[PDB]
Amino acid sequence: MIDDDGYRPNVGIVICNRQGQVMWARRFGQHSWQFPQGGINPGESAEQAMYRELFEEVGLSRKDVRILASTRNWLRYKLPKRLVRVCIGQKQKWFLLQLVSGDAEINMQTSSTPEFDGWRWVSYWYPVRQVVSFKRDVYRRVMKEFASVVMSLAA
C-alpha cells in the first residue's frame, strides 16, 4: 500500500466547467472543503484509480467528463504530526476534468462510504486560500498548472 518513503500513492481531481469555476466539495460531517482525492489501490493505474474515486466520491462516470490535463510528476504533502495514525503523507497525481454532463449528475451517495455532503461551484482562485493549511502548497502548484486550460474554456 505504502512506498518506502511513507507516502500513500493518491490521485486528486479538479473538475471544472466553462465558466472559470471548479467543483468544491464539503467533507462529510465537517466544515472544511476540498477537491476529491483518493488512494491508488494495488494493481491500478493512476487513471484507473481516478475514475474509480470519481464515481465513489462524486457519482460521475467516465462518460460525464473529459480529461483536460494531468500533473506530470508526483506532488507530495506530509500530514501534521498530530494527525498521523505507517503513512506520513500522500504523493499525488492530479487530474483536470471538464464536466460535460449536467450538474445534476453529481451524486455524493453512489458508494457505501460517502466522503462529501455535497458541493458547489467556486471561483478558480478560491481553493488555494480555503483548503486546510497542510495541503496549500500542493494546491497552489496544481491550480497554477491547470490555470491556462480552465481559462481557455471560459474565453
83 phi/psi in degrees, rounded to 5: -95, 5
> Which sign, positive or negative, has the C-alpha torsion 40, 44, 45, 47?
negative
Smallest gap from Cβ 20 to Cl ion, in A, equals: 11
**Is residue 59 close enough to count as binding Mg ion by CB under 5 A?**
no
Grid cell for residue 143: 491550480
Q: Quick one: 57 or 64, whose CB is closer to Mg ion?
A: 57
Alpha-carbon distance of 82 to 44, in angstroms, equals 30
38 binds, among Mg ion, Cl ion, none (CB under 5 to 8 A by kind): Mg ion
Binding residue (CB under 5 A) for Mg ion from 6, 20, 39, 114:
39
Binding residue (CB under 5 A) for Mg ion from 38, 50, 71, 138:
38
Closest among 129, 133, 146 to 94, alpha carbons compared: 146
**Is residue 12 close enough to count as binding Mg ion by CB under 5 A?**
no
Q: How many residues bind Mg ion (CB under 5 A)?
A: 6
Coil, helix or strand for 120?
Answer: strand
**Is residue 27 close enough to count as binding Cl ion by CB under 5 A?**
no
Residues that bind Cl ion (CB under 5 A): 18
